[PDB]
Amino acid sequence: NGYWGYQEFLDEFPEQRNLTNALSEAVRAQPVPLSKPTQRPIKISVVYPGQQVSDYWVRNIASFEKRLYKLNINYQLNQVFTRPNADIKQQSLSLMEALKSKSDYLIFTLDTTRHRKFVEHVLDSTNTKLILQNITTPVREWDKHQPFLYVGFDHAEGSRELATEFGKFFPKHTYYSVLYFSEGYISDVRGDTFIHQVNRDNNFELQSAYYTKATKQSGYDAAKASLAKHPDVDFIYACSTDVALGAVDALAELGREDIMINGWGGGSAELDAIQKGDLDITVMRMNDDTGIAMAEAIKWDLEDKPVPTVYSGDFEIVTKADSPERIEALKKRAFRYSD
């Protein structure tokens, strides 16, 4: 709460549903280069998390850049990567550092339930247009001055999808445990969604839930702790890729192939795990649509057209039973720009 649902926000503001639908159609269709020429190259700053097992951020940037080049948009890209185990203070520092640069657009990610007012205050203190990655639920407080774009793949949707699938894999009252992200927005929107739906619809019983540092090692450690205290579960729900892959390592170590485990995002490492059989299911992002959306949103802004506040991309479900052909087809769709 303090957030709009994606679909709810689109229901409340039809103009926005039009703008977002239009953007989706623009993403789907062939590049249509910049109508109105620019005065000079546009300056773009990026603050993203580096050194993760998840390829989402790097792929995102790659697709963004490809699409910019095809729209004949002339840009300069200053990329900053935050070291892992980087505090939120450290992230905020990287962020101010990037604001010094006085760029036209700033693309970044930050926990908005832990640094809500910080971001609200950055918003009110620069002419740089902000794009918030990996969030698709606009903040209610910010009605006076929303950022230029919230962009991502809606966490609650993907979680609902996973919930529905686990509902098919297992009978009512199944015991399970959860591996959250770090405390904050992602855990709330991927984990609690899942727990709520699964409890309400299938009467599953949660045996334990653990926060992580959002790293592979942490998902491994947390899986080990969790199974040490609660060995008897039929599956573990993981809130993210790195945590899932750590947990897979732990499950192999403890010899627990009787436990099911999901991925979250469906990037390359996950798809490999799925094809190996290590990961049982995932919800796959059609990854590149969000890089392209951002490039399309900047075009419109430069052609002086209205830009929607939010854009979410779509998902597919993938299981270890899917054929190589299905997988390759999905990769063809998701990594069309970033390969």
Ligand X SMILES: C[C@]12OC[C@H](O)[C@H]1O[B-](O)(O)O2
Per-position b or e across 126-149, b if 16+ CB within 10 A of its CB: eebbbbbbbbbbbbeebeeeebbb
Closest CA to 256 of 227, 276, 215: 227
Integer Cα distance of 292 and 28 in angstroms: 9
Question: Which CB, 49 or 191, lies closer to ligand X?
Answer: 49
Q: How far is the CB of 280 from ligand X (least distance, A)?
A: 16
Closest CA to 308 of 14, 2, 4, 5: 14
Q: How far is the CB of 137 from ligand X (least distance, A)?
A: 14
Question: Which CB, 26 or 279, lies closer to ligand X?
Answer: 279
Question: Which CB, 110 or 227, lies closer to ligand X?
Answer: 110
DSSP-H helix ranges across the chain? 6-12, 14-28, 56-70, 88-100, 116-123, 155-169, 185-186, 193-202, 216-229, 241-254, 268-276, 289-302, 324-334
- Positions touching ligand X (CB under 6 A) are 49, 54, 56, 134, 186, 240-241, 264-265, 267
Question: Which CB, 66 or 216, lies closer to ligand X?
Answer: 216
In the bound complex, which residue of the shown chain has the CB atom lying closest to ligand X?
265
Question: Which CB, 138 or 266, lies closer to ligand X?
Answer: 266
Q: How far is the CB of 17 from ligand X (least distance, A)?
A: 25
Question: Which CB, 191 or 265, lies closer to ligand X?
Answer: 265
Q: How far is the CB of 201 from ligand X (least distance, A)?
A: 23
Q: How far is the CB of 333 from ligand X (least distance, A)?
A: 17
Integer Cα distance of 173 and 205 in angstroms: 6
Distances (CA, A) of 334 to 189, 252, 261, 289, 297: 23, 29, 22, 8, 19
Q: How far is the CB of 238 from ligand X (least distance, A)?
A: 9
